[PDB]
């Protein structure tokens, strides 16, 4: 959970991009 | 599960968009 | 400084990534 | 919060407003 | 949205990063 | 790229025109 | 290959400031 | 193979700039 | 100190947004 | 040493303010 | 490019994040 | 920082300036 921490960062970046006008939700 | 499915494998963009809205 | 695009949300995984939050734009 | 905080500016301490 | 110069090469790692890319701005 | 992207706007789906 | 994917995210970054106008190549 | 070179060690502004075009 | 290397990024820009006009200092 | 402190657990943001100027 | 704001930070950590630096924006 | 860097441009030697 610090590796996923970081990882995490990258992820809703990722989803900021891949869902666009729809948006997204995260969530450990 | 986010960070249990795609912070273990490299996901697809497919699977990342089980996440959007 | 403006929050504007994926710096709204790196600033809301600052604050909110331990315990999820939602991103909706509209 | 893409007004609140894009348009016009906001705290982090504003943005805990929209975690879980 | 418009994305522009370190953010056009993150989009090109989402989508391409795992086959690779080239990125030549001219 | 950065007529493409940065100022026309573009697709994740035209991004992956560039990939390799 | 999941914290190289993560490290290939900063170092493309890390190319697009070093490089300029002459642009890289990345390439697993 | 700059996945190989640069996630193994903290590679250099020089070594990265091996792969600019 | 490579994946240390990698999480000083998020450091910094984790610091350059809790910081604000005060700023801060990084060092390993 | 935030590397020391901050890349071994995840830090809180009280504590991340203790390198702040 | 211009640097500013994030980016600005992020190009100081390409250069100095081995050996530290500090960012005192006034 | 932010005059040298953000207002006017700077390299990334010109950067270097910075270190510790
Ligand atoms: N198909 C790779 C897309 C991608 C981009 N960034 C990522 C981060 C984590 C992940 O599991 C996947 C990704
Ligand atoms: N000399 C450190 C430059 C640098 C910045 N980001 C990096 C990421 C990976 C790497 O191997 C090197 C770097
Ligand atoms: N409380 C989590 C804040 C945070 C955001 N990014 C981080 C990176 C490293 C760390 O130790 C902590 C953080
Ligand atoms: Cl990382
Ligand atoms: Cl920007
Ligand atoms: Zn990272
Ligand atoms: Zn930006």
New interface residues.
Partial sequence: ???????????????????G???????? | ???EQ??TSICS?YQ??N???
Same sequence: chains 1, 7, 9.
């Fill in positions: 959970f610090v590796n996923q921490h970081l990882c995490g960062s990258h992820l809703v970046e990722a989803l900021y991009l891949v869902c006008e729809r948006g997204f939700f995260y969530t450990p | 599960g986010i960070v795609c912070c963009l990342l968009e996440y959007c809205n």
